[model samples]
Target: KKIKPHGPLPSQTQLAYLGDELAAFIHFGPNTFYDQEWGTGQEDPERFNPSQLDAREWVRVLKETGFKKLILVVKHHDGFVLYPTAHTDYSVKVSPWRRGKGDLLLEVSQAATEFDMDMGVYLSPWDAHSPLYHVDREADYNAYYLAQLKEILSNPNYGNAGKFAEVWMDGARGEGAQKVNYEFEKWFETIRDLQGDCLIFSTEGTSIRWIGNERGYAGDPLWQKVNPDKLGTEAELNYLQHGDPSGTIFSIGEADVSIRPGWFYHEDQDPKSLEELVEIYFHSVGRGTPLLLNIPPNQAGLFDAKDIERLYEFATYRNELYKEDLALGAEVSGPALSADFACRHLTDGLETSSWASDADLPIQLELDLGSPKTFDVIELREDLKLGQRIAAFHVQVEVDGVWQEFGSGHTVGYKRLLRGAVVEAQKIRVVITESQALPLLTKISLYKTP
Candidate 1:
C-alpha cells in the first residue's frame, strides 16, 4: 500500500513554538535547596527561601545564551506552588522567603517581560500536598486546579497582562495510595477560555507533544502529522518515540533535557560540557524539532557560575560558526524551476525567499562558492508555511575535481543542520531523492567551526 504524503501546515500556535526553536526550563522551589527532585508534601515552606534570589540575573544569562523563551515550573510534583495562590495555602504566600509575602511567579514574569522574552508555565497536575489528591474529593480537586489555572492565565499582576505563550502539564499521576483520574479535557477548555492564543503541551490534547524522553533528542524522520484519537489513552510511548507519518493532526514534537543529570539544582551535580550540549542541539533542533533545555537555579536562586560559563561557551561557538554564511551571493543552479522560484533563492539568506521545483522527483541543487572554501557544516531549511515535503536528501562537495559525499538526512522541516569533517571545495550540491510533493528550499548555508 502506498503511504500518504505530509498534509496541512502547522497551526498558529505550532508556528510560534517552532519560531522559538530554543527555550529554557527554570526548575526552582523547595526542591532546589532541599536537594530533592520530588519533594514530599510535608516540606516546610520556610525552606523555600533563596538568600540571593535574582530573577533579572536569570533572564540575563538566558538572553546571553540565545534563549528567547523561558518556562518556569510554577508547580512541580511536590505540589508547592510558586506564587500566592488564592486556592491553596501551600504556596509562596506562606513561606518565609519574603516574610510570607513573596511572589516568585510575579518576579520571573516581570523579568521575562522586561527582557522581551516569551514566558511559559508548567503546572503539575499531581498535587501530593493536597488531601484531595487521590480521594473522594477528586472532583473538587479538579475544580481547584482549574481555578489555579484561571488565576495564572487571567491575573494581570503576574506580568505581561497574565498572558503566557505555552502551558505545560505532565502526565504524572498522584503517588498516593489510590489512583486519581485527571480531567484533561476540562483543564484544556479552561486554558483555552482564559488564553486562546496559548499553546497547551501534554501527553494528549493541544499543539505540542513531548518527545517521550528527557534526553533532549527526537527520532530521525520525525513527522509532524499524528492521529491522536487512534492511539487512545496508552499512546504516549508511540507518540514520544516516533510521530505518525500518515496521521491526522498536526502535532509538533518538543525535546526537553536538563543541563545537568537532574532537573533541579544539586550541590554535587556537574553541568554538561559545551561539546555535549552542542551534540544534543544537533540531535534535537538540528533534526527540525524545538529544544527546551533545562537550566535550574542554584540554592542562591541564581544560575550557577559553571552553568553560565558553559552556556556562554556554547553560544560563542555557535555564533562564531553561524555569524556569516558562506553561500551568500553564491551562484545556484537546480534541475528545474517554476515561475519565480529561481535557484538563487537558496543563497538569498532570507527564509521568506525560496527555490521551488515542481518539475519532477530526484532534483539536485548545485551551489558555486566563487572560490575554494573550507566548511564542515551545511544548513538547510524549508518554507514550512506550505508543509514539510522533503522526505530524503543528501549533500556532496567538489573536492580536488572529485565529488565526495558530505552528509545526509531524512526530513527537512523548518531547518536541518548537517556536520562532517572539514572539506575544502569550490562547489557543493544537494540532491533531493524523495519528496512528497513539490520541493521548496528556503535557505542553504555553509560554515566552518574552529
Candidate 2:
C-alpha cells in the first residue's frame, strides 16, 4: 500500500513550532519588581518601570543564542497590562514610565519586526483585579477577555509583532479567589480567525501541550500523538507526560522551564549552570519536543549580565557539541524500496523526502562512513507527513566484520536522539524493531560530544 498518513497529522503551524526547536517566554510585570511569582492587583502601575528596557537587545541576544522566537507576557494574573488599553485603569496607560506614554508591547513588537524574529503574546485568563472576572459577570468577563485577545492578535498599532508563532494559555485557578468560567472556546475561535497559522500552547486547546512539570525536560519516549479525550486524568499525569499509544490528535509536547530558579527575575537569583543547561537540552529538545525557555527580564528592563553570560556559555557548549554530522554523505543502502524512495534521503536533511520500507517483520538501513568515524549521539527522524511510525529501533555497528547493538530507542516521531558510549565504526545500520505502519524515515545523523 502507498504510505498515507496514519492518523491525525499536524497543521502547518504545528510543523513550524516543532521545527523552531527553541523559543523564549518573557515574564515581565509587577511580579518582577515585587519578588512575587503571583502579583497582587493592588501594586501601583508606575512600579512597572524598567530603567533600561531594550527590546532589540533582548531579541538580538536570544537570536544569537539560537532562540528562534519569543512569547511576551503582555498581562499576567495580577491584571497589569503593559500597554495602554480600553479595558481598565490597571495598565501602563496610567503609569509614569515614559511619562504615561509607554507601550511596552509595541516597543517589543517593533524590535522583533526589526530583527525578523517571531513573537507571540501571553494574556492570562484569570484576572484577580477585574470585577468582570467574577462568576456572576461571566458574559461581561468573556467579552473583555476576547477584546484583549483581539487587540494583541489583530491590533495594527499595539503589540503587532508581525505574525505570532504560538499563543500561551496558562490555566491558573485558585480556591479563595472569585471563580472564572473562562470562555476558552470563544477565545480560541478569535485566535484562529486572526492568526490562522499560530499554534496554541495550553493543556486543552490546540496542537501543543504542557510537559506536566516545570523542570524543563520531557519523558524518555515522548510521543507526539495523544487522544484528547484521555487527558485530564486528575491522578495520572502520564497522558500529558508520555502521549497515548492508542490516541489520535497530533499534539506535540513543550517544556516551559526557567533559566534561573524562578520564572521572574530577582536581584539575588542566578542563572542555571552551563552543564545543567546542556542536560536540559538533552532532556527537553532531546526528547523530540520544543523547549520554551523562560528568560525573565530584570529590573532595568534588560537581561541580567549574569544571565546573558550563561546564555552564551550554553550556546557555546551546543555549538561545540553538534559541530559535525559524521553520517552525512555516507554510502547508504537498504532493501529495494524504489529509487523514488531511495535510502540516500536519510542524511539529506529534508523531512519531505524519506525512505519508505515494506511492512516486513524487521527492517534495516545500513550506512558506511568512508572510514571509521566517531560518534556518541545517534539521531533518527520519521517523515511526520506520514504520521509517527517505527515504534522501536536500535543501531548496529560493524566491528571486525560483525554487527552489534550500539544504541536503541522508542517512538521516533519527528526526531529522536539516541545517546550511548561513543563508538568508532566504518559501517552502522538502523534496525526498526517495531512500527505502526510501513516505516517512512528521513534522517539518521551521528554526532560526538565536545
Worst 10 residues of 2 by lDDT: 229-238
Instruction: Give me candidate 1's TM-score against the actual structure.
Output: 0.95
Q: What is the C-alpha RMSD of each candidate to the true structure, in Å?
A: 2.7, 1.9
lDDT of 2: 0.81
lDDT of each: 0.83, 0.81
| lDDT at position 339, candidate 2 | 78
Off by over 4 Å in 1: 1-6, 159-161, 175-177, 230-233, 236-238
Question: Residue-wise lDDT of candidate 2 within 1-450, one digit each (tens)?
Answer: 466778778787777777778899899989988888888788887787878889889989998998888989988989999888888888998887788898888988888877777888898888877878777787898899899888788875443345777788866654543666777778888988988867887767367888876687777567787877665424246667777666688888888889988889988889999888888888877778888899999888999999999989888887887789999888888874777688888877665687887847478789998899888898888778778767788899987788878988888777777788887889998989888878888888999987
Q: Report the lDDT tens digits of candidate 1 across residue range 170-221.
A: 7777545546778899988988888886877887846788887568777878
Best by lDDT: 1
Error of 2 at 303 (Å): 0.2
